[PDB]
Amino acid sequence: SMEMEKEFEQIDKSGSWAAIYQDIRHEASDFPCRVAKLPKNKNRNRYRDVSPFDHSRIKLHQEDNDYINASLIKMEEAQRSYILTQGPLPNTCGHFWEMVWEQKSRGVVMLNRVMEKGSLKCAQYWPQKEEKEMIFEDTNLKLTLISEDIKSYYTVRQLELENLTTQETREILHFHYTTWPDFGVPESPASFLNFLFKVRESGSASPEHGPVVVHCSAGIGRSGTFCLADTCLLLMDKRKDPSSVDIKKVLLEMRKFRMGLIQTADQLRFSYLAVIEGAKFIMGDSSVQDQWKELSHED
Ligand SMILES: O=C(O)C(=O)Nc1sc2c(c1C(=O)O)CCNC2
Ligand SMILES: [Cl-]
Ligand SMILES: [Cl-]
Ligand SMILES: [Cl-]
Ligand SMILES: [Cl-]
Ligand SMILES: [Cl-]
């Protein structure tokens, strides 16, 4: 087994996932969020305790107010960036697509549903019907649903985003994980990795494009889990060396760029499981990807 597998077993056998996770919260970076906290930005933040750091926040190219609750997670060694953002609010959906446009993102990963636990965790920021496109008047963008591929626990949407100022259009892919509970974990490593490899294979995360946008309700819990596993698998892939990947150290590196990434100890535990199971594909057993697809019951 791998070094992370033995560590996983030691932490399980001694029941210290809560302790290990609190250790991560204690060591995590603390940087100012002065812009997030400005009075004029109060209604641009979904949660008062979830803010982007000033040093890594995404600036909208607006002259009025450039603030969006969104962070550039720039993983230097992995050579991959992400934008993590909260679920857009009814007044920031225009800001959200403005950011996608200005950052040249081609992929949006959504890990939440619009309604969770009786609560509206995310605005309805993309059109649900081909014939009912959305126009964002404040930012001059048009958004059309082109097609969608609905599977049992996730949906992939092809969207067309148009800058109405210039009439340039871009295809944006929407990867929507629909069965991941807020503050919870996916039903299995298999269905998580099946989704993650769908995102990887789409070409959304190609460096020819801007960073993939990843969001949940707050942009930290499920978003941090997805991003930690993706980066750890990428690092393992570049090195073909599972042993060189220190998962906790990678999470602490990500938390330099946005607070609160991974919100429960069970999500941390799930991260390990996803990485340990994904390593089988990375290290040359490609049949495992077909096993994941079968186990995830996406039909
Ligand atoms: O959606 C996620 O995965 C996530 O991080 N959610 C978060 S993080 C977070 C909250 C929520 C929420 O959804 O209520 C509420 C206030 N504290 C922090
Ligand atoms: Cl202000
Ligand atoms: Cl939804
Ligand atoms: Cl509900
Ligand atoms: Cl909302
Ligand atoms: Cl935290």
Please report, for the chain, the start and end positions of each structural domain, with discontinuous segments joined by +.
Answer: 1-299
DSSP per position, 195-264: HHHHHHHTTTT-TTS-PEEEE-SSSSHHHHHHHHHHHHHHHHHHHT-GGG--HHHHHHHHTTTSTT-S-S
Please count the other Cβ atoms lying within 10 Å of the Cβ belonging to residue 165: 9
Q: Six-digit token pair at 127? A: 């059109």
Between CA 39 and CA 129 the distance in angstroms is 36
**What residues are in contact with ligand 1 under a 6 Å CB criterion?**
47, 49-50, 112, 121, 182, 216-218, 220-222, 263
* Residue 73: strand pairing partners: 82
> How far, in Å, is the centroid of ligand 2 from the Cα of 13?
51
Q: Quick check: 270 and 29 in contact, CB under 8 A?
A: no
265 annotated binding-site participant = no
Residue reference for tokens 């009786």: 118
- Cα(99) to ligand 4 centroid in Å equals 29
State the angle between helix axes of 265-282 and 189-201 in degrees (0 to 180), rounded to the nearest 10: 60
241 is in an annotated binding site: no
Say which experimental method was used: X-ray
* Active site residues per annotation: 216
Q: Which ligand is nearest to the CA of 39?
A: 2
Instruction: Consult the annotation and say whether 78 binds a ligand.
Output: no
Which spans in 49-141 are helix H? Answer: 93-103
Residue closest via CA to ligand 1's atom 15 equals 47
Backbone φ and ψ for 293, nearest 5 degrees, come out as -60, -45
For ligand 1, atom 1: residue with the closest CA: 217
Residue 219 C-alpha from the chain's centroid: 7
Q: How far is the CA of 218 from the centre of ligand 1 (A)?
A: 5
Question: Which amino acid residue places its CA nearest to atom 9 of ligand 1?
Answer: 218
Q: Which two tokens stand for residue 137?
A: 């008047």
If one counts every other C-beta atom within 10 angstroms of the C-beta of residue 113, the result is: 20
Which listed ligand is nearest to 116 at the C-alpha?
Answer: 4
Distance (Å) from CA 15 to ligand 3 centroid: 35
CA 191 to ligand 4 center in whole angstroms: 22
Residue 182, annotated as binding a ligand: yes
* Residue type present at position 183: F
Which of the ligands is closest to the CA of residue 27? 6
Closest atom of ligand 1 relative to the 87 alpha carbon: 1
Q: Which atom of ligand 1 is least distant from the CA of 50? A: 18
CA separation, residue 120 to residues 2, 36, 140 (Å): 41, 21, 25
Q: Which residue, judged by its Cα, is nearest atom 11 of ligand 1?
A: 218
- Distance (Å, whole) CA 73 – CA 205: 13
HSE-up (13 A, CA, CB side) for residue 131: 0
Distance CA 58, CA 82 (A): 11
